[PDB]
């Protein structure tokens, strides 16, 4: 039975999602998250759908960029595997921490 080696499909997926532009987080979960967070600041808020979409575009763009920086950090430590300390280093050098 056929089996690709670990990493081959990963590389395939990198090519695939770097080629595409669609949102990568599922809509209903994100929206639910957004409303949950919004309740903590001010109550009985409504959202234009496009407001939710702006938030999702922004978040996914932010995470993808963070993962790029995180990856450069992993590689800097001669690793191919990203770890929390990579994220933490990237966020510190960005000024987020």
């Amino acid at each position: 039975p056929h089996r690709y080696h670990p990493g081959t499909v990963a590389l395939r997926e990198i090519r695939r999602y770097q080629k595409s532009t669609e949102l990568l987080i599922r809509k209903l979960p994100f929206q639910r998250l957004v409303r949950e967070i919004a309740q903590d600041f001010k109550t009985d808020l409504r959202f234009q759908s496009s407001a939710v979409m702006a938030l999702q575009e922004a978040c996914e763009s932010y995470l993808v960029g963070l993962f790029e920086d995180t990856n450069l950090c992993a590689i800097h430590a001669k690793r191919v595997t990203i770890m929390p300390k990579d994220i933490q280093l990237a966020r510190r050098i960005r000024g987020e921490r």
Binding site: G7, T8, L11, I14, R15, Q18, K19, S20, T21, E22, A54, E57, A58, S61, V64, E68, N71, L72, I75, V80
Partner: protein
């Protein structure tokens, strides 16, 4: 007879002038200022559309989409610099895989 036509521009000089006058930028606006500003906006626009259009043609689309704008912008050192902190909705990212990750 429009100020735009007088300047040989497509971008609207009159609108730009009104936007300067109403934007709380200064008490007064000189006559050449919106002409100049409109010209600059038109130029940058034409630059981005030129590259984006090239990308749309290469993808054999007659229609420019956000993806083409992103490709155009990130592959140009100066546009990318100018738009460094900007997120292009539905633009995606440049295909780039760090060498170390490739097999062999």
């Amino acid at each position: 007879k429009t100020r735009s036509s007088r300047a040989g521009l497509q971008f609207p000089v009159g609108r730009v002038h009104r936007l300067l006058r109403k934007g709380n930028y200064s008490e007064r606006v000189g006559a050449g200022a919106p002409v100049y500003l409109a010209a600059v906006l038109e130029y940058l626009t034409a630059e981005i559309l030129e590259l984006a259009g090239n990308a749309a043609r290469d993808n054999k689309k007659t229609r420019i989409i956000p993806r083409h704008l992103q490709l155009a912008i990130r592959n140009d050192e100066e546009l990318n610099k100018l738009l460094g902190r900007v997120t292009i909705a539905q633009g995606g990212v440049l295909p780039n895989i760090q060498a170390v990750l490739l097999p062999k």
